[PDB]
């Protein structure tokens, strides 16, 4: 799951079953906060490292006590006699705590666009969410990391973000704010910026090529050929109706449309069992590790088709960090961890990370970002 | 055979959920739901509680897979499990399968679980997976296949949990392809619809949700008198409707079916609603909720206010347990159902198991010839006991309901 | 208040143990027993089943320790737990503590758990441990301290599970230091001994095990008539003996105490023994065991043959469950106890909870003024319900029994 | 616990609940055996490595199927309708499987003397067990690893093994078998052999010094001083009545005798809570790791007193292996894993290891060693 959330959940459970969760529990909260701050400083030798081995690194001193006190007044979770705090609520607590930790401020806010901004299969379609990103764009750089691989063609990427770009053109671009907006395609392969006319344009590759570690063209082609052989073997033994699609630095297994239960004349994408997709992801990672590949890559499920890309969203996050000359403490990222189950590419060590189950919680977290100043 | 002797425990609580997998607000698309079932710590206890028999088979197949022998001749293990299943069919009480699992229920047919496994495996080749063992969704598909293949003789009654399968996300019936399967099945066998919605005795309100479906019924079914076999049940076991010549529901006279339902002195009914109303009012005050209470004749509910204002899922669970505890505190033995919906809370003085038995006794159908289409993710086990009333099939989405009904259509 | 309404479930089974921590053959010295309690996967489910209330406190203190606040002012958590304990003392049925734990039982005294924690911590400084949280053995010591400190008014009855505490490894009583504590306590309060051994109505055989203890009784206690308060109970609740002028046991007349025990038609008693004897004979044949069956008037047992030939512990567990299942198959409702000893198997048509209540009613003692010294590792929960009859203390070895009795000696 | 045992236990449980455990289950057993042999060959890339990460290395092809079939006829564990196979029984199965795996034979048999041979606090006192070691001594070298630290004084070590040495003198030493017997004191610090007169004598340190990796005298003294400071701090805050005892290369915390509950005039060793001893072991390991000590050492509980020695029983096992010029496949060790809870010194990778809860199971395992030839 996520060992840190389970740590706080189990503590709150045991505090609840003692029938003292609604009294003054500041001694427990302050002790947990002092332990969290003691992991902020001297992280490798903190006591939290022994209690939880996969804490990672904390880049800010979060006020978990003040965050709990603030959230509890809003939802009154301590008043419930029969329902103790849940996994979802503790996730909300740590989200508010991470926002409150950034007292000095941040300059880079990144969104895993596949997970939070647009609902998969459609374009940006949230007028209120565009307004929150709008006012925040003025104060800080906002970057968008998207897994779509359209090479460096900015028109295809604009089709998904057209509504937000139209909002930019109407209200943001007036006072030079528009320069702060950045978009990252592929995983770390294509970069796009915004212009005065509110239209996406690809940044020259030579400007940001030096920041990223080079990956040999022979090595990536080796990766795609391995993935092609595995996907072909997986289609053969499961008798699937899918095909392998190869991009410049991307390869995926996409289902073929077939006539289905709709009578006479209609189509539906061939449903591939989610279990078969996970089996394929494990086979691909097993074969890639067998060939001793050090180059970073990401093989993810993400819906009904499987895709293997070179580079990970963490690499694009660190690219934007090093390019904009921002320290790691002053940048945060909004992304959903339910979609990436096994991780191995989680950015908990690259930048601050927020967990937001649906676009409505994104509005709530972005409202808190507005209130922070 | 009777609701009085059937085990309910309406005022019990399933062990608490900290991960809130039932929260269909956070879980959104089916992709995120399927991720958590792979991780055992995320969903184990919640899962097995919904259907322990399936989990029992998951553990056997898991050990078969990790022994690296799941793809060899495993017919000895499967035949042994089938032999336990048949021995539980012949002698359900005090069987050995009953000893292993207390809540296994009753089997009404000889389950050919071996053939169901061989056929399901041959179609999807799930045994070829070297790194992913068979998951919970696939063994529940096998149990569906085993129950369909078991049902060799035929059916007379088909029942649908209408809130779960027929209505998309609370909307009205809007699946024309599904109507064709339902119409062809009504021609051959009786079709019963049980829905938790309580619209008093207003037949037009119940028809409004089934308006699209009844249009297909009037187009093709009205020709051969199959419409008489169609029945709808309101409340949970409180109101009964049949179909007339036109595509409109007409209420069955109360005197015709009154005796089949277990008697409730009615004074207790409104005592239940008064306790629930006081608890919900206190819950609204305590959490400052923006909601309204809708009270029916024998039903009461807590519904969010129109913008819909969001009610915290955990507050809904808190209020359900408060109502059950306060109902115990007044020592009320009447069978009822207080369930936690996605956005709404509802307390009904009926149970869908009670209405299923009422439909069985009215139509004078034996239990072997009765089946039920229902999703076991949403309904708690204490409110509706699984496989105690009839054969039970599990369907997660309208597509699997289509496939099950198509397979039932080609029966024998 | 009565054995008839008390919850037994004599024919139930505790969830199976794969690690066999109860196997005192493999576990040998107390060092190896203490190792496994630190690992949660080794002993969790088995432990909590023996005393869930203690485990409930372990989880709270575990979360307090991992919060790195167990050594700060934790009096708010402890006072809240104490407030739940007192609320469970006033209203045990339907209390909130009863909601958290179903098998908590009844409290007969206001537990000062806060003071018991503060005193136990101040003596051993268990809160100073930075890497090891408080274990199960230390919280069960605190519960012992909380129950002794709770008992403020005083005692009239003291009961010993003789098989567990008095006899060393099945030998006769051979602890002269313990006799002094027992003698001083008899002077002030009545002392009752319940032992599972069944020697028919032979008072000399029961005395042979207590011969060393009765020598001390005759030396110091006989002077002040305290010997009259001493009572011994054979079988499990079948035979009763008192003390006479000399250091010899004399049987209490049956007519004096017959009515207190729940009636058994006796014909069922021998039906139970016949079922058990047939099951044990089949078990001996099936596993080729070298053992003998000893049948008493109202007791029957399976005992290893003299060289002692070793009987596999798991075969003993298998035979216990076989006997319970076959007893159910004949639908026998009489309260009995079939327990799995270390080397022997025994089926008694009595229960130590039934005999404890018989001693309570005979001496006309209120439950608040009754206590029991017993080890909860050996006795299963279904046979002897914990804290349903009187206050219960947990003792692992003769040394802790000495310390508890010394603390009881200085009471008020 | 021990992940491998749990693997077999859970499989046997699921086989039992299917009500097929008494039928022909050779397909499951042979598949598990083939998987075990496939981890014997190419161990780093075996499928067992993925299913169980801590399998370690297997030095022989064990016949787990034949071992189960042999054991089942003896105890009829498949006939039990209500009790599935336990942790103890599966441990017995793997013991028999490891014995049967040594078809070619072994030349070195080692006993953790603290755990199996003598019951703690007493000397060797098993006439029948001495007979089994007697006949086995002729065919193979038998070594004894004991944690007692008496320097290189052979008289103190003979006091614990006097009964077995007397058995050696009467029946073994007649035909030159006595030369095979070896004893290892400390952990890997003192070595003893047997002579014609059946009396222990210390082997010269220079003969076997080269095989063991050298540990600086400054480093071991650093270890003992750290342990002395920790034990002193532990005695101070718990108010214990114990004292620190320092040997050449050993240091321990030993309880002080105090007058106890026995009236007037008697003594008893001060009881130290087992929880305090575990807390001290963790503190000592934490401080030693903080000072970056690479030298092998062992800090164990083992009763009522705590002892910290330099070197581990694994080092003595490998010393005797390299000294006697024996391949790892032809040597086994009999020791109990209940006493060493957290391990970190388990010899599952050094040699074959048997698990034997009491001296009676040692007699049973040594009878099987007799039957192997």
Residue numbers in the entry:
A (entry chain B), D (entry chain B): 59 to 431
B (entry chain A), C (entry chain A): 10 to 316, 327 to 431
Could you pull the original sentences from the published paper?
Maintaining the optimal nucleotide balance required for normal cell proliferation is controlled by 5′-nucleotidases amongst other processes. These enzymes catalyze the dephosphorylation of ribo- and deoxyribonucleoside monophosphates to their corresponding nucleosides, and also exhibit, in certain cases phosphotransferase activity. All structures adopt a tetrameric assembly displaying a cross-like shape, in agreement with the quaternary solution structure.
In the presence of ATP at pH 8, the activity was highly reduced. The structure of PfISN1-ΔC10 displays a PfISN1-ATP-bound like conformation (RMSD = 0.36 Å) confirming the role of LoopL430-Q444 as activity regulator. Upon mutation of H150 to V, PfISN1H150V-ΔC10 is no longer inhibited by ATP and PfISN1H150V-Apo is not activated by ATP. Indeed in PfISN1H150V-Apo and PfISN1H150V-ΔC10, V150 can no longer interact with E419 and Y129, resulting in a reorganization of the effector site and an increase of the activity at pH 8.0 and 5.0.
